[PDB]
Design a binder for this molecule. Sequence first.
Ligand SMILES: Cc1ncc(COP(=O)(O)O)c(CNOCC(=O)O)c1O
Ligand SMILES: Cc1ncc(COP(=O)(O)O)c(CNOCC(=O)O)c1O
Lengths: 401, 401
Amino acid sequence: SSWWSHVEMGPPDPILGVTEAFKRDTNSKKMNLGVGAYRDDNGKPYVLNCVRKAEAMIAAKKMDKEYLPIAGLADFTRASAELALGENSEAFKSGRYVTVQGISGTGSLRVGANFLQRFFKFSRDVYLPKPSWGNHTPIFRDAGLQLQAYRYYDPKTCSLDFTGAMEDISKIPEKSIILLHACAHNPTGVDPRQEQWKELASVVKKRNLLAYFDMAYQGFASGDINRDAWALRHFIEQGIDVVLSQSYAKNMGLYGERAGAFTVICRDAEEAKRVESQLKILIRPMYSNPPMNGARIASLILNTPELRKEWLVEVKGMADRIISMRTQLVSNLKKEGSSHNWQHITDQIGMFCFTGLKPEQVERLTKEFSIYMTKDGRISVAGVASSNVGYLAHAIHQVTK
Amino acid sequence: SSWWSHVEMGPPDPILGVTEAFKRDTNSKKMNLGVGAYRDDNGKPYVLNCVRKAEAMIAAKKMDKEYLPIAGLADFTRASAELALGENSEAFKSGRYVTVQGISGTGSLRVGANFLQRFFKFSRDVYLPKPSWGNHTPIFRDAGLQLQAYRYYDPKTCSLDFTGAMEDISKIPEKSIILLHACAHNPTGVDPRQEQWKELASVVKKRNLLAYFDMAYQGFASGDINRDAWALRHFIEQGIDVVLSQSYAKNMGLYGERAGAFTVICRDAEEAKRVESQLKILIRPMYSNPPMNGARIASLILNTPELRKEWLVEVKGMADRIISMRTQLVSNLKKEGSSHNWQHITDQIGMFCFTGLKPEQVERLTKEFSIYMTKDGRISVAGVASSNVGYLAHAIHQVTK
Ligand SMILES: Cc1ncc(COP(=O)(O)O)c(CNOCC(=O)O)c1O
Ligand SMILES: Cc1ncc(COP(=O)(O)O)c(CNOCC(=O)O)c1O
């Protein structure tokens, strides 16, 4: 029958648009700055060394393919909580958290969203920073929640609109939900500094808000696992019982294996068990039980001292290269004689950098230099390499002069 | 804090209770007839040889771990449609279908349910057979649909209530959604015979209902992939545009890897593309993209003639062991001098058997013989081995005399 005749073609992804054009282009100087995953100095995908080793170990052990418990691989969940909270964290040692395996960060966000829709009786409003990762909208919207915003990004400075944020958060009706990026804000790269974080916590705590941390770049941002989880741990220390989403897509290069976890900070171990039971009832009818590969690999690395050690060197390598490219970019623009202030480029943290380029300049860059990026002036630092940072500096200048 | 004080401990799982209870038992003759997965003759998990062959191939190539498209691995989806529909199916050849990778069977059903909630404007009603897999309820309910039922299982004969089914479907409001198990009904093992299927088709066609096929046991039920897809293929041939969910959990032993697919039979290629666009928009906020491992393994096997061929031998090997245990249970029950009719045991198909046992009998069985099963009298045939089938038979006779 003609059941779907009324179904219209959904809109095309602007992001896919840029990568399709990049692919068509024959100029060997082409650059893809819309890329969403890490790339090495050669512009190639990168499977960590400790990943290959973990993998090799699994093969050796001739493990079965049996179903994992609903909540996932217990060695993976425990290790996940420990990674996030810190070993000597009171939350962790008291076992007053509940961690469940989710389908990477996205799945983990969704599960958390479905959990709040069901049990967070106090409000349906989720406040996102302006701007946020595109997916954040439909995630919360599809789960049945209401969307709100708080100023975050400042276009004047390509930095934190600290005054704007504080004024916005200050007017948040008590017992509302606020989504915060732990580090390496997507898509701006603009993160609060320690001092800003401390004032943010104070008000979150004061207005008695439910803080929902999105931690998708732990270790990948600064190169330090402890530094990256700083804000999140600060909140929990100040008595803010958060909810959290962790992704291993970037820090482990696990992209397609989809490994992540959803965590709930509870009053105690008693309550944690109750929440856990409820999280299980929710997930069953979603997908029953999670993909085991990614978790097995992740658990082995975090759980195996020789592997974990290698993992930290490797993760650090990734982060150092991105910083390097940022550094080189600013220095090269000066070298080109750019009068403009490009500090933001080096103040910004992680994979994404909001250049401050305007839509017209982006166009010149694409049309004239074969540099592919979105019209918002957002560049993926992963697409920069030692071999082309110069070229990019050149082009940016040409179009900004 | 204290956001969660009101969250209560969720109901304990029955299936789980029997596995746990079993574990804690000391009898050496104890048996677990509650197992939800296939077990070999020694009562052990079984990774297909063809599966190991596939993993070794992937390993040698040194593949990346990059994100798959939202819809999943194209080699996987195409192959999935092909296995279901049949190589020379008209639906296949015209390209008037759309198949997206799902998180095994559960995940595929959920996407499908969410999709219907969103676009199936003709009704909110889903008709499940009485009885069905527990999970079927929350899947639909959580998706936002209303559940109804049609008579299926006949407790008096432990066979199909064909009459009641035919009468019930005849009275189902037009353009309603009806869930059908392609083969090896879970939990009864009661399936319509080819001739009864032909009759059901006609009624479904006439009432102009949307048939939602749940195919979790293709090839694993009877040892023949084509024979198992019979009913599915007949509906389509008759001009009923179904929607379908596939699982590779059982047939390939991919349990924990989570390999599945959701398919929509459309009017044409043009509508197929509109539908796929909309399915992508739905999944994104669910989990972004699917786990790659299972899809990789599945695809290699389906696409490589040599592996595909070995697979068909292994699947057949699985179906036969099961059929053997059924044959042997009955014969051992007679042997014992049991006077009851146990033909149902051999009449039934697949891993699950509705024995007809009553609760208190089940109780004595657990208590007195150390035989673990659900109180509904359902047993997993996978839990029966040649070495213990005699033991089972004796126990049942004892409890039923
Ligand atoms: C803040 C943030 N949270 C969460 C996530 C989710 O990441 P994943 O689902 O890969 O774990 C992302 C991932 N972005 O990359 C995926 C994409 O844009 O298609 C992210 O930036
Ligand atoms: C008819 C039917 N459909 C769909 C499914 C879903 O199976 P899966 O999600 O493992 O692919 C099942 C799975 N049953 O066993 C799985 C379990 O109880 O954990 C099923 O029997």
